[PDB]
Amino acid sequence: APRSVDWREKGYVTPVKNQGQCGSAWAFSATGALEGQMFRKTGRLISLSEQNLVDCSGPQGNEGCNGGLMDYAFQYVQDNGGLDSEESYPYEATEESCKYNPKYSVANDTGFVDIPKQEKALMKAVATVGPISVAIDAGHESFLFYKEGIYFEPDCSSEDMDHGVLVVGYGFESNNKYWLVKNSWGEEWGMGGYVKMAKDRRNHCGIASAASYPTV
Amino acid sequence: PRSVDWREKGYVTPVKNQGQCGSAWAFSATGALEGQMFRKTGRLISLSEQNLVDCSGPQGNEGCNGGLMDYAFQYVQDNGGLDSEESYPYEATEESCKYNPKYSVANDTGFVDIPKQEKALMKAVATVGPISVAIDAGHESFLFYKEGIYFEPDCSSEDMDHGVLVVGYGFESTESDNNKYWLVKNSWGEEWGMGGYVKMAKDRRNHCGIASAASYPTV
Ligand SMILES: *[C@@H]1O[C@H](CO)[C@@H](O)[C@H](O)[C@H]1NC(C)=O
Ligand code: NA
């Protein structure tokens, strides 16, 4: 119910990372959400290994640099019973064979929860839980070139909502409401790697596409 | 090493905004102390600038009208504590002291001043963690800075009076030993610069440094 929420301020959120030319956004979105939930549990923020996810979470349905799903990532962590740190298992921006080492695991999870495709539901989750994984439409040139301000999706379509990102908060610029959204295109994109997305729009849509978060 | 970046190592809180209050000194000091507390404990906790603004007058600080990061570090020593950002929020104006020792999350033991050589600063950055320094922030092109390498347009000791935090260095090029820069965290919020950061020209050939008033707290 609070009118603003920002989880970075609360220490839940690692610095912005860069996926490279590898279609692995699903992995950065997943690690973001798990980093948040591990922080809540332990109080220790530890950057998590996307590469671990990209290499090893095929059996759950993920396709490495060719795409994947935050939920499949959360399921891998449960099945696997851990996930290595970013430090122990660094990002290569390409799919290699699995190198999971249990001795370097710094995260578990216990399941995951899908949120309904409603901006009100997303609000309640963000206010309550921590950073939330979602997928957005990242396809448009104006989003490529984004620098500042509230970004308005020109265009509402389910199919195109397929780039994984992390909702770390919400606020208002004033009226003029926005989600605070951490991307994985490095800190030179957008507002040091962040974007404010228009929120509670009027025209009915919609970034609560495939919203979800792990349980710990 | 040829690149250092303490953010990636967990040392650095998110960019804060000092507002219209002349308190960069306090944000620079808390950034440096947040680093060294992390190095010690492995817990990263955001520290109160308001606590510094309100309470470190007796060490020589002047709240919203200026001060020095060394004075901040001295206060934390003398005080025997510093409140968390959460417990003692930033208001961008000077009020009466409200330090509560029950809410202390940081100590220090003193501080170390670094010589104004870019090489002595490089060693410290490489070896200690994020370092407090003061730069010249007065120029319009620094105000409008968005990306790339920033070149200080003159060298002038008296104008280097805006406290910031050096959190690393590296190089632009595909080369290295060319287009070197310091990574510098500002306190002008995340809409200034590159997410609140600036890459400052490093190892220049006119021998103008930025290691003006360099120091870090000991813990
Ligand atoms: C800091 O040091 C003081 C005095 O030695 C001690 O009483 C206090 O518990 C310490 N506080 C923290 C947060 O380390
Ligand atoms: Na795999």
Swiss-Prot record, chain A:
Q: Where is the active site?
A: A25, H163, N183
Binding locations of Zn(2+) 4: E92, E96
Which residues have a glycan attached per UniProt?
Answer: N108
Binding of Zn(2+) 2: at which residues?
Answer: E50, E86
**Which residues are noted in the entry as Zn(2+) 5-binding?**
D137, H140
Which residues are listed for Zn(2+) 3 binding in this entry? D71, D114
Q: Summarize where Zn(2+) 7 binds, as residue positions.
A: D162
The record lists Zn(2+) 6 as bound by: D160
Give the intrachain disulfide bonds.
C22-C65, C56-C98, C156-C205
Chain residues that bind Zn(2+) 1:
E9
**Name of the protein this chain belongs to:** Cathepsin L
| Lineage of source species | Eukaryota, Metazoa, Chordata, Craniata, Vertebrata
Shown portion of the complete protein runs from: 114 to 333 of 333
Curated annotation (Swiss-Prot), chain B:
Q: Where does Zn(2+) 1 bind?
A: E8
- Chain positions recorded as Zn(2+) 5 binding sites: D136, H139
The entry's active site is A24, H162, N186
Record: residues binding Zn(2+) 4: E91, E95
Q: Where does Zn(2+) 3 bind?
A: D70, D113
Which residues are glycosylated according to the annotation? N107
Residue positions assigned to the propeptide: 175-177
Which amino acids does the record list as binding Zn(2+) 2? Answer: E49, E85
Instruction: Give the residues the record marks as binding Zn(2+) 7.
Output: D161
Disulphide bond pairs: C21-C64, C55-C97, C155-C208
Instruction: State where Zn(2+) 6 binds.
Output: D159
- This protein is called Cathepsin L
Source organism per UniProt: Homo sapiens (Human)
